[PDB]
Amino acid sequence: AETDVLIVGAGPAGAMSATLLASLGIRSLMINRWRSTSPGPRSHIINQRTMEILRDIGLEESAKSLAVPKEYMGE
């Protein structure tokens, strides 16, 4: 097996790297020890830097559709 970039892990950091790299034409292979994406919710707060990245790569609208908006989070 050959590739330009081997990405070990498929959580947020690995998945994001893979998406960006593949968007740039770079061959990559992303691997994960387990069966699935993480079963637990684990981490829920999405700050503006991350939403900006999603916006740039075109996943913001889809992110917003699954996400509980800001006005539900205040109290």
Next chain:
Amino acid sequence: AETDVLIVGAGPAGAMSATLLASLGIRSLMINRWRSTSPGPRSHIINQRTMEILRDIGLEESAKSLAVPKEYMGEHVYATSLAGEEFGRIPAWASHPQAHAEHELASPSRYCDLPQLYFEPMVVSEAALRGADVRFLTEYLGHVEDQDGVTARLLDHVSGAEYEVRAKYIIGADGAHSLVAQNAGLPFEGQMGIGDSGSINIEFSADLSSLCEHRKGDMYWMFVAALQMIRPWNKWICVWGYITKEEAKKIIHEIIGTDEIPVEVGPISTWTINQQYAVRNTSGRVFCMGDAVHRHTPMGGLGLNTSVQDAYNLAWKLALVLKGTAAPTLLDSYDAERSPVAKQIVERAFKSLSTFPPVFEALSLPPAPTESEMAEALVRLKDASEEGAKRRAALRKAMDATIIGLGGGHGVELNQRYVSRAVFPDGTPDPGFVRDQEFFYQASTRPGAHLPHVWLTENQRRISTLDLCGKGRFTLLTGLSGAAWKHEAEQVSQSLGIELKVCVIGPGQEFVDTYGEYAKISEIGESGALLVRPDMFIAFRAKDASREGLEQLNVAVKSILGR
């Protein structure tokens, strides 16, 4: 590599099977030749059967969040170009208020638009999280059955390795050129579908809100090319019957009928189908489903939906046999119940094509007009003569008849009628359909029919009869005077080691017949009982709670399970 069920293919039928199986505790391994879920949207119409399945396995809300709702789908426009003049419209996807009432009455769920592009990763994701092993870049090469299982082989497109994966059953979910169906030796029929011409599909991005927002429609047809919404109203796809350069940008610009709004051409695809259906879908330990056994035209959006329902018929059955709760003969009902649906949709999807020629004939246009020939057609259409009046009426009659493949086929969608060893007949004759069975759904609680939807209440909140059932288990529905069913069901349940959940609907119970709609729909007295399979179909119906009525419960379950 070992597993109970090897699932070849990870589109709607495979992904759905994996999710259902993993939900039932069954070890499975799902494979896919390619890198990803399908790149194209391909198939967008989600009928009520599919939404009900998503509802049962808990993905409906998430399905609804990504999906364009029903009220955006109604305006089907026939015109010259998007910014040109309309010939007229038909109310598509049951947007006519009467169609809409029939629609809402039939299910707790609704038409939506969700391209395959989003549906697949959604379901493949859940499959993997519920327990299914999922492995892409891996190709089924062949298999060998023997008395205890199968031992197919795989080509691993990442490591280059090739290995074997023993399994108790194989599901062939591998599409329009299913190698699993060939190997299993399934007979096909009805190849005659008119020359098997492909279509061409051009993706593109452009903001067409100003031409669309006021007549919200799922698709705009031009006289024939279909301009189809992917996202309202900026992502699109241009489609028509059948190489092309980035010249396709010109084609689009005339289909839009105005080269003013910026267009950004995406990928270009070709689809060429061969219309056929499998006469049988089962052979030994091999079970096929989806495009693998029913391949047809897009008219009606029956493919993805029937595919997913194939998977819903089969999973709970595999699970019972694998658990030993059911004899392996329960699996014979898969072919008996799903194969008639397979021929029904190929034939139906084909029959709809013939509703378009008449549109041209009304226009007095040859199977293929010229520019000047079309232009004259529109002039003749505004003719203030008695003959021009006859022509406008002829055009309207022809347009109206295209509804059958654009939302009008409700009966086709929902009127499943199962006859098999997994439906215990109640002795009544088939009541048939009072109205056209293609156009109109007729609810029935006779064994073999899907359970009818009605609203009950739980905590003064509306809940569907459907939401009482499913969950991969047999549910028995009765009323206060059918109190005895609770006990019979328990006895039956211990004997057979099979879970059946009983709901006594009535005043002061968990579930209340608050509108009386259940008493109205059930077709039997209050103390009657309906037995509902994991896939929502009724398999047994008792007309009361008398001795003989109750005694028959055990007999029925014992007959459904093959024991």
Next chain:
Amino acid sequence: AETDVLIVGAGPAGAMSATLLASLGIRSLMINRWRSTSPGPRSHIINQRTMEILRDIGLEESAKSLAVPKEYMGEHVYATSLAGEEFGRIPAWASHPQAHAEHELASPSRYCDLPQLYFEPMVVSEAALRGADVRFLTEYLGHVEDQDGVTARLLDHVSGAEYEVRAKYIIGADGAHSLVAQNAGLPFEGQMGIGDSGSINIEFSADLSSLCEHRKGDMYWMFVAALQMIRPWNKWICVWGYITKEEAKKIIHEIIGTDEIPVEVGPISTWTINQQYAVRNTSGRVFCMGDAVHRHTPMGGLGLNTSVQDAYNLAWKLALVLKGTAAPTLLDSYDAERSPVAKQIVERAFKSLSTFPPVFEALSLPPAPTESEMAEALVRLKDASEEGAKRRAALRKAMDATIIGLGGGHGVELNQRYVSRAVFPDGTPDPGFVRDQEFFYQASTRPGAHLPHVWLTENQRRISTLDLCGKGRFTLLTGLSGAAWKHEAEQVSQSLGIELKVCVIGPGQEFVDTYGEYAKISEIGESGALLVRPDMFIAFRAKDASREGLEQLNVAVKSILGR
């Protein structure tokens, strides 16, 4: 003081009358005995005919802003108390999906809930701005007709002065004890409606959204007291059949079934009603409308809606005669067309009352049950026996039958059928009704029927056939092959001095038969014509554009105008 029309009364019929007349250029003076528009909510159900009228005169969007929409009115709950246990619900105000379609198909408008408390000042204010003189604290004492007009005596409750007014016509919109109907000598029939019966109303404030938000309804009936939403869900009012001090707060608490949500007792009123109808509504120069000619129960909410429609029938007619465009015989059609509606609704509102007793008979209660008797009837209702099953079904049958006064009377609301000199017969016989004419609307384009609603498009935007008409003028509707109507209408208009707009609906026109629903609904060929009165009733129908067809328009309009 001098005016063209004196309008005694400023509730719905009087106010609507003043608004329409001012919109038509007619000087009128509207008076009211009291200080301000009706203090109480006093009736809340707005039907579609009324919304159509508000649409025509441009107050619909405004009415919809203050009103509670249809989706909030459907859950009609029968229970012990709000916080107690439901007996069941029925789908009120056409909330069942089949009832909802039938509703949506009949009109561009919808049921809403708008208390008279708000409706009144909205219309009175528009009367004043459009040109009507409005004078409250002013009481009509009597009048004396002569050959040229009438001279009424008024008592000014601000200045104590008493003065006269000279007018050409009087409208008696002065309510259930109309002194204008007395002096005009109008005969009344049907006094027989039980012993005279009155109800009591207790306004109160309280946040009951926790018992109401999950089951949104216009009413909650407790077994009989009605709990009625004024504003969702904090302004309310108890109603029930018939002095009371702040003990009214114990009643309320008992109706709510809990004393845990803070309450605030407002005004306490009674209402009497002596059910009768006027057999004739016209005497010389005096015209009565509203409660003044039809007095009845609130079942069905036909009162305010019929009253407003009384005024819509009359206004354009007074205007045409006052302008000399029409002979005074045109006013004869007011009684011919509206008096049958008057008897119809008194009898209907009364007949609905007899749908309630059977609810109690099903519970095997008596006309009036004790607290023990009521708690025994609930126990019997939860009985797990065949005898109990029969009782639950008997209750459901009885409850369902009460729907006729709670949104089921679509036919009553819409099936007006006028026969008079202001409707020119077309030679066709009365086709009657295929289904029950009380429960179901049947659209018709035969002269004497309201113009049917369908959707055309203007600029690719939906517009109702109704929105092409009205505006206080005659409108003639035809299609492309009926182009000749344009000229024939011009000649009639010039000779008779009457405005009649022609609309040629069809491809390329200002109004397009986009869905073909006009061709479907018109009942005649494309070149046929429909003539629509200012009040939306069809007064003339030609089946084509032939010579004899065309020549008849003049005769028709002449005949309608009394000329």
Next chain:
Amino acid sequence: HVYATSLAGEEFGRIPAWASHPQAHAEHELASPSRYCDLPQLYFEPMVVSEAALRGADVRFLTEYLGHVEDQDGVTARLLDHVSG
């Protein structure tokens, strides 16, 4: 708030009117439970006049004040009634 040549012409620029800038919006939201809205007098007027009448005020249009004369205990005004003359 748009400054332009014509509605369908070309903007010179815009400014954030009626506290629409986010900082202006916060300052606004912090000062009161209420907000700016646009409601023409054409509608505001009949809404309040009608509430005056229902709450207890006597309301008399077509009636003109001509003058008055104050004394120690009250005032006596002369009105001209434009309906009755």
